[PDB]
């Protein structure tokens, strides 16, 4: 992983992530894993955003359900 | 990029492979205005396409096509009748079946003719008649070629063929030996198999017979108050690369968006009328004829006359000694202009004309561009200016010139 | 809504038709629309869209003949009299000439109505 | 063989330029596009209309090559050049024979990197700009849509014409154009795409050879991000009455949706539901849209089309009617708005038909190298990426009738509308009577 990853590949990740198939997910994870080897100064802001969203994001395990409290109040 | 003809089960085929998700299927039929028995028969016969067949009504056809997500389009030209169908690649079998059913069995109900077919043809005829340039080019064709391709295409305002004439013309025109099937989807073998399977029960008739084209000349004058027009027409035999290179040499438009150009016609207009009358040249190749036309358009009649005179002088001087660089640039432009007409899926004059004649087609026709010499172009030009040309004038007739005063 | 008739279920069984032929003969004689020189299909109501469209798809000869027959019948009805027994509508000429066109129009309308209401049952 | 569907490669350079090429193996023509994310919206009230002036310019020779030498470069090699300016982006493209692409790319890079904007050129082009502005006015559709834009987003820079006022055109100077070029032509907001014979590696090499000097912008913003404040929809009407015209062009629109809005394809599906019509259509009677049925049955109008023009943070969603049956315009408008409002109880079959039609139409349009290049450029300039057909199919398929009903009740139900009329529009009623048809009282 030496060449910079194209911006149109790491833009609006949250909307696309659910629809995006498994193979693209593994490819992106592997590419970012190979990328983070270099010193982080040379990296762009969007790469950092994508990396953080991949690691400490909302998808995957920590995707909890949200309950509308107003609905509970009105039902009561 | 090139159609490779075959013949399966006695059916003409022309396949093409492209990396796209959408295919097509067109049936080019030799039933144009050249072969019509009376005025307006071909147009009405074309309009009857995709009407009530022997298996499904027109409403069912339209609703099924709408549900499947496809576009059904027809096209009438001076020497063909074309029925197309663009679709996603899933419904290729269904669309082939529909086209085969439409061509083979299509009952002609007189009330359908009196209800839907006739008003649509009349509306199209009025829409064509409203335009001025198309009428001028049609009159140029009428004056150039006496009959055959010199016949009017669209329905005249004072004609109304009976249903029996259309029915018998369709009976003696829709036969296996008088059309071809053209497909340009992402697969050719499957399309060929389906076309051979479904376009197989149509009877083995006989090809329609027409006389060789007869070439003459004449001038027509009409009056108008708006933009003035003046057209020159040089009839010629079947198209050759020399004619294409000559047409690209004449040019007329601009290579870049906002400029005047540097071809012969642009220089003539600039030197004559200070770019107050645009001159444009074009070529229309037919099966056994071609028409190289020059169109001079503008608002000032005097500028039109001066531009016409200067353009004719330049065309006459083009036969003396053509510099090599001019021929090189003309060939370079003509290659691109000819090749660009094959990308669109819908057929035009160039692609249909190439596909009709299997002797050359497009495989060797393009290869012959790079073997054109200034002597060949000079010979072609000198042969064109032997017989008199033909003119059509629209606008104030007191200033627009006749052919004897160019 | 529309005229109704059990004119096919009886045709299914030949015995019923053979039994009911004389009664139908007597009834048609008693109706007396043939005494005015008319045909049965002339009397059918024409005020909806279907029959109005159908009447515009007849051959011109049929329309002209129907117009003349109706006008002559009304002229006779003016003076309360009938034609002599020679100029009565013979059975051979009293055929159904409007029903097929109306059937075609109704079939077209029913096909459009069917397409109108659809559903997706996965 | 079955072949395949080529994929759109994407590569970026050090500066930030993005390259996206679709390569056809067997082809003889190629198209190259270079787009800039700066339309006429970035112009202020003083220097309005500079983008169109730049578009007309920048073809008059750079410092290295003068005019009448650039054209000879684009004629003796068999090429074409073109450019058009929208309200948010500018596009330059040039397609030629497969063996004359690198020279055209080099010429385009020379044109965009530096130009010799001279006072004499501006003085010469002033008159041609004035003539273009005068000649554009004749067309009815352009005037109707310009008036609709002006009356919808009034006050905002998005509500001005692209060409600009006459005073703006005549008073423009060299410094304004130079400043616009300096502060809006940055490598972060540029793009270069292709579709045809050329390959990805060749175009990347060409871009590195030539487009390697464009300095990035001061702020590191994204592509297609909103700039300025969100415009406010202001429902109003404009009546440019003229009794000489034998027709009556009318356009009605409501608040639209942006590129990134999470219901975009639902709005597209609704537009497909409404559909288009024309009296010259071969199968006009048999179309399966109720509005077409009524209009054709009663001969109410000549034709009508539906549009869903969208922008960075707003958009429009309406219809465009042309008619000559004067005196029955009110019935046409009433039935159009009734069919609009009915969409809150839409049935499954209509939604399925609209989905199929939209899926077919989104792919049947691309049939040439120029069209594919334009589509790729626009998708990259407005969104940031080009959606593969799999993603588009998945997004469209998820849409159901309940989503359509929700969106219609949210935006199509009783709400402010924007009207624009040109011609013999006397038969058109007031604003309140027009608006009253947007909601049905029998529910
Ligand atoms: C009960 C109250 C319901 C109000 C009725 C109504 O809104 O109109 C009928 C309305 C039908 O219109 P729609 O299809 O729902 O769409 C209404 C549009 O806004 C279309 O509206 P529009 O802008 O085209 O104008 C129509 C509206 C405009 O009329 C007015 O502005 C009323 C003017 C005053 C006249 C008298 C009141 O006319 C009416 O409301 C009908 C007035 C009746 C005239 C005289 C009555 C005589 C005896 C009946 O709904 C009904 O038929 C109501 C009953 C439903 C039963 C189920
Ligand atoms: Zn302009």
UniProtKB/Swiss-Prot annotation, chain A:
Q: Which residues lie on this side of the membrane: Mitochondrial matrix?
A: 1-69
Domain of life of the organism in this record? Eukaryota
Subcellular localization, as worded in the UniProt entry: Mitochondrion inner membrane
Family, as annotated: Belongs to the cytochrome c oxidase IV family.
Q: What does this gene product do?
A: Component of the cytochrome c oxidase, the last enzyme in the mitochondrial electron transport chain which drives oxidative phosphorylation. The respiratory chain contains 3 multisubunit complexes succinate dehydrogenase (complex II, CII), ubiquinol-cytochrome c oxidoreductase (cytochrome b-c1 complex, complex III, CIII) and cytochrome c oxidase (complex IV, CIV), that cooperate to transfer electrons derived from NADH and succinate to molecular oxygen, creating an electrochemical gradient over the inner membrane that drives transmembrane transport and the ATP synthase.
This protein's assembly is summarised as: Component of the cytochrome c oxidase (complex IV, CIV), a multisubunit enzyme composed of a catalytic core of 3 subunits and seevral supernumerary subunits. The complex exists as a monomer or a dimer and forms supercomplexes (SCs) in the inner mitochondrial membrane with ubiquinol-cytochrome c oxidoreductase (cytochrome b-c1 complex, complex III, CIII).
Protein name according to UniProt = Cytochrome c oxidase polypeptide 5, mitochondrial
Which start and end residues of the full protein are shown? 39 to 114 of 186
UniProtKB/Swiss-Prot annotation, chain B:
Which GO biological process entries does UniProt record here? mitochondrial electron transport, ubiquinol to cytochrome c; proton transmembrane transport
Location (main, coarse): mitochondrion
User: Which keywords, in A-to-Z order, does the entry hold?
Assistant: Electron transport, Membrane, Mitochondrion, Mitochondrion inner membrane, Respiratory chain, Transit peptide, Transport
Membrane-spanning ranges: none
- GO (cellular component) term, any one: mitochondrion
The record's subcellular locations are:
Mitochondrion inner membrane
What is a GO molecular function of this protein?
A: structural molecule activity
Q: Fetch the Gene3D superfamilies from UniProt.
A: Metalloenzyme, LuxS/M16 peptidase-like (3.30.830.10)
The way this protein sits in the membrane is described as: Peripheral membrane protein
Chain's role: Component of the ubiquinol-cytochrome c oxidoreductase, a multisubunit transmembrane complex that is part of the mitochondrial electron transport chain which drives oxidative phosphorylation.
Regarding protein family, the annotation reads:
Belongs to the peptidase M16 family. UQCRC2/QCR2 subfamily.
Self-association state and partner proteins as the record states: Component of the ubiquinol-cytochrome c oxidoreductase (cytochrome b-c1 complex, complex III, CIII), a multisubunit enzyme composed of 3 respiratory subunits cytochrome b, cytochrome c1 and Rieske protein, 2 core protein subunits, and additional low-molecular weight protein subunits. The complex exists as an obligatory dimer and forms supercomplexes (SCs) in the inner mitochondrial membrane with cytochrome c oxidase (complex IV, CIV).
How is this protein named in the record? Cytochrome b-c1 complex subunit 2, mitochondrial
Source organism: Schizosaccharomyces pombe (strain 972 / ATCC 24843) (Fission yeast)
Swiss-Prot record, chain C:
- Show the stretches that span the lipid bilayer: none
GO terms, biological process = mitochondrial electron transport, ubiquinol to cytochrome c; proton transmembrane transport
Identify the InterPro entries for this entry.
Answer: QCR7, QCR7_sf
One GO cellular component term? mitochondrial inner membrane
In terms of SUPFAM superfamilies, this protein maps to: 14 kDa protein of cytochrome bc1 complex (Ubiquinol-cytochrome c reductase)
What does the annotation say about its assembly with partners? Component of the ubiquinol-cytochrome c oxidoreductase (cytochrome b-c1 complex, complex III, CIII), a multisubunit enzyme composed of 3 respiratory subunits cytochrome b, cytochrome c1 and Rieske protein, 2 core protein subunits, and additional low-molecular weight protein subunits. The complex exists as an obligatory dimer and forms supercomplexes (SCs) in the inner mitochondrial membrane with cytochrome c oxidase (complex IV, CIV).
Similarity field: Belongs to the UQCRB/QCR7 family.
The molecule here is called Cytochrome b-c1 complex subunit 7
Lineage per the UniProt record: Eukaryota, Fungi, Dikarya, Ascomycota, Taphrinomycotina
**Which gene carries the instructions for this protein?**
qcr7
Curated annotation (Swiss-Prot), chain D:
Arranged from A to Z, the UniProt key words for this protein are: Hydrolase, Metal-binding, Metalloprotease, Mitochondrion, Protease, Transit peptide, Zinc
* Activity regulation summary: Binding to mas2 is required for catalytic activity.
Cellular compartments annotated: Mitochondrion matrix
Q: Does the keyword Cell cycle apply?
A: no
Q: Which residues form a coiled coil?
A: none
InterPro entries linked: Metalloenz_LuxS/M16 (IPR011249), MPP/UQCRC_Complex (IPR050361), Pept_M16_N (IPR011765), Pept_M16_Zn_BS (IPR001431), Peptidase_M16_C (IPR007863)
This protein's cofactor list reads: Zn(2+)
List the record's Gene Ontology CC terms alphabetically.
Answer: mitochondrial processing peptidase complex; mitochondrion
This protein's superkingdom?
Eukaryota
- EC assignment: the record states 3.4.24.64
- Give any GO molecular function from the UniProt entry: metal ion binding
UniProt record, GO biological process: protein processing involved in protein targeting to mitochondrion
Q: Can you quote the record's cofactor note?
A: Binds 1 zinc ion per subunit.
Annotated catalytic residues:
55
- Annotated binding of Zn(2+), by residue: 52, 56, 132
**Where does this chain mainly localize?**
mitochondrion
Q: Does the keyword Nucleus apply?
A: no
Q: Which family does it belong to?
A: Belongs to the peptidase M16 family.
Q: What does this protein do?
A: Catalytic subunit of the essential mitochondrial processing protease (MPP), which cleaves the mitochondrial sequence off newly imported precursors proteins. Preferentially, cleaves after an arginine at position P2.
Quaternary context: Heterodimer of mas2 (alpha) and qcr1 (beta) subunits, forming the mitochondrial processing protease (MPP) in which mas2 is involved in substrate recognition and binding and qcr1 is the catalytic subunit.
PANTHER family documented for this protein: GH01077P (PTHR11851:SF149), METALLOPROTEASE (PTHR11851)
UniProt protein name: Probable mitochondrial-processing peptidase subunit beta
Query: Which species?
Result: Schizosaccharomyces pombe (strain 972 / ATCC 24843)
């Amino acid at each position: 992983g030496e060449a910079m990853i194209a911006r149109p590949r790491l833009v609006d990740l949250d909307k696309r992530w659910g629809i995006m198939s498994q193979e693209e997910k593994d490819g992106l994870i592997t590419d970012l894993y190979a990328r983070q080897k270099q010193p982080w100064t040379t990296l762009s802001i969007e790469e950092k955003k994508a990396a953080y969203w991949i690691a400490f994001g909302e998808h995957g395990p920590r995707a909890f359900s949200h309950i509308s409290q107003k609905t509970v109040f009105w039902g009561t | 990029i090139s159609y490779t003809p075959k013949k399966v089960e006695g059916v003409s085929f022309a396949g093409r492979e492209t990396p796209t998700a959408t295919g097509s299927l067109s049936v080019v039929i030799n039933a144009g205005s050249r072969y019509q028995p009376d005025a307006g028969v071909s147009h009405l016969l074309e309009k009857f396409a995709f009407k009530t067949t022997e298996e499904r009504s027109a409403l069912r056809i339209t609703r099924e096509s709408e549900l499947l997500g496809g576009q059904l389009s027809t096209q009438i030209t001076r020497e063909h009748i074309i029925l197309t169908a663009r679709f996603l690649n899933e419904y290729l079998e269904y669309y082939a079946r529909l086209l085969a059913e439409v061509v083979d069995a299509t009952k002609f109900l007189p009330f359908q003719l009196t209800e839907e077919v006739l008003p649509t043809a009349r509306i199209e005829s009025e829409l064509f008649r409203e335009d001025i340039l198309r009428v001028a080019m049609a009159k140029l064709h009428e004056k150039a070629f006496h009959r055959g391709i010199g016949n009017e295409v669209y329905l005249p305002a004072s004609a109304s063929p009976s249903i029996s004439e259309i029915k018998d013309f369709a009976s003696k025109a829709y036969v296996k030996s008088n059309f071809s099937v053209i497909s340009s989807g992402p697969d050719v073998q499957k399309a060929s198999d389906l076309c051979a399977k479904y376009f197989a029960v149509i009877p083995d008739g006989s090809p329609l017979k027409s006389a060789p084209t007869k070439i003459s000349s004449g001038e027509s004058r009409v009056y108008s108050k708006g933009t003035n027009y003046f057209c020159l027409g040089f009839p010629a035999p079947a198209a050759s690369p020399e004619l294409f290179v000559l047409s690209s040499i004449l040019g007329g438009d601009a290579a870049v968006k906002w400029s005047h150009g540097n071809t012969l016609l642009a220089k003539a207009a600039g030197t004559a009328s200070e770019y107050k009358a645009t001159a444009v040249a074009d070529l229309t190749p037919y099966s056994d004829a071609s028409l190289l036309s020059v169109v001079i358009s503008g608002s000032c009649p005097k500028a039109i006359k001066a531009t016409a005179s200067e353009s004719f002088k330049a065309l006459k001087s083009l036969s003396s000694n053509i510099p090599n660089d001019v021929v090189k640039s003309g060939i370079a432009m003509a290659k691109t202009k000819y090749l660009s007409a094959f990308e669109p899926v819908t057929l035009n004059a160039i692609s249909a004309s190439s596909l009709v004649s299997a002797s050359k087609g497009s495989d060797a026709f393009i290869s012959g561009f790079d073997k054109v010499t200034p002597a060949s172009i000079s010979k072609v030009v000198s042969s064109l200016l032997a017989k008199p040309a033909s003119t059509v004038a629209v606008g104030n007739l007191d200033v627009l010139p006749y052919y004897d005063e160019l | 809504m529309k005229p109704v008739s059990l004119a096919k279920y009886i045709q299914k069984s030949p015995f019923l038709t053979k039994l009911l032929l004389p009664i139908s003969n007597a009834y048609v004689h008693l109706s007396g629309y043939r005494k005015y020189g008319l045909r049965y299909d002339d009397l059918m109501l024409e005020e909806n869209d279907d029959t109005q469209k159908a009447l515009s798809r007849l051959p011109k000869m049929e329309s002209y003949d129907r117009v003349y027959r109706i006008r002559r019948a009304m002229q006779l009805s003016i003076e309360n009299k009938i034609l002599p027994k020679s100029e009565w509508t013979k059975p051979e000429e009293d055929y159904h000439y409007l029903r097929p066109v109306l059937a075609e129009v109704i079939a077209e309308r029913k096909e459009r109505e069917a397409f109108d209401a659809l559903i997706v049952k996965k | 063989a079955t072949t395949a569907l080529p994929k759109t490669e994407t590569t970026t350079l050090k500066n930030g330029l993005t390259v996206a090429t679709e390569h056809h193996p067997y082809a003889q023509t190629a198209t190259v596009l270079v787009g800039v994310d700066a339309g006429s919206r970035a112009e202020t009230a003083k220097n309005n209309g500079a983008a169109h002036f730049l578009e007309h310019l920048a073809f008059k020779g750079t410092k290295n090559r003068s005019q009448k030498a650039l054209e000879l470069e684009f004629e003796n090699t068999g090429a074409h050049l073109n450019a058009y300016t929208s309200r948010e982006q500018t596009v330059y493209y040039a397609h030629a024979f497969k063996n004359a692409v690198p020279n055209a790319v080099a010429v385009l890079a020379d044109i965009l990197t530096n130009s010799s904007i001279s006072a004499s050129a501006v003085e010469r082009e002033r008159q041609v700009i004035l003539r273009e502005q005068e000649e554009v006015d004749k067309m009815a559709d352009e005037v109707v849509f310009d008036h609709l834009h002006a009356t919808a987003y009034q006050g905002h820079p998005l509500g001005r014409t692209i060409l600009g006022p006459k005073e703006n055109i005549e008073s423009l100077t060299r410094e304004d154009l130079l400043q616009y070029i300096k502060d809006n032509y940055r490598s972060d907001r540029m793009i270069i795409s292709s579709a045809g014979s050329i390959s990805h590696e060749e175009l990347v090499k060409l871009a590195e050879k030539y487009f390697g000097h464009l300095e990035p912008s001061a702020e590191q913003l994204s592509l297609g991000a909103p700039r300025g404040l969100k415009p406010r929809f202001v429902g109003s009407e404009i009546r440019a009455r003229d009794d000489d015209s034998p027709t009556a062009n009318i356009a009605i629109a409501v608040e639209g949706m942006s590129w990134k809005h999470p219901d975009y394809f639902t709005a597209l599906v609704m537009q497909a539901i409404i559909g288009n019509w024309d009296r010259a259509m071969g199968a006009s009677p048999h179309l399966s849209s109720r509005l077409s049925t009524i209009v054709q049955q009663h001969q109410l109008a000549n034709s009508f089309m539906s549009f869903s023009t969208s922008y960075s943070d707003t958009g429009l969603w309406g219809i465009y009617l042309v008619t000559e049956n004067l005196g029955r315009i009110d019935d046409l408008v009433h039935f159009t708005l009734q069919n609009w409002a009915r969409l809150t109880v839409a049935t499954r079959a209509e939604v399925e038909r609209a989905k199929a039609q939209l899926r077919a139409s989104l792919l049947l349009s691309l049939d040439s190298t120029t069209a594919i290049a334009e589509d790729i450029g626009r998708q990259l300039l407005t969104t940031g990426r080009r959606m593969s057909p799999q993603e588009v199919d998945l997004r469209i398929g998820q849409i159901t009738e309940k989503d359509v009903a929700r969106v219609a009740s949210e935006m199509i139900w009783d709400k402010d509308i924007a009207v624009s009329a040109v011609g013999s529009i006397e038969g058109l009623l007031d604003y309140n009577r027009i608006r009253s048809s947007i909601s049905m009282n029998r529910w």
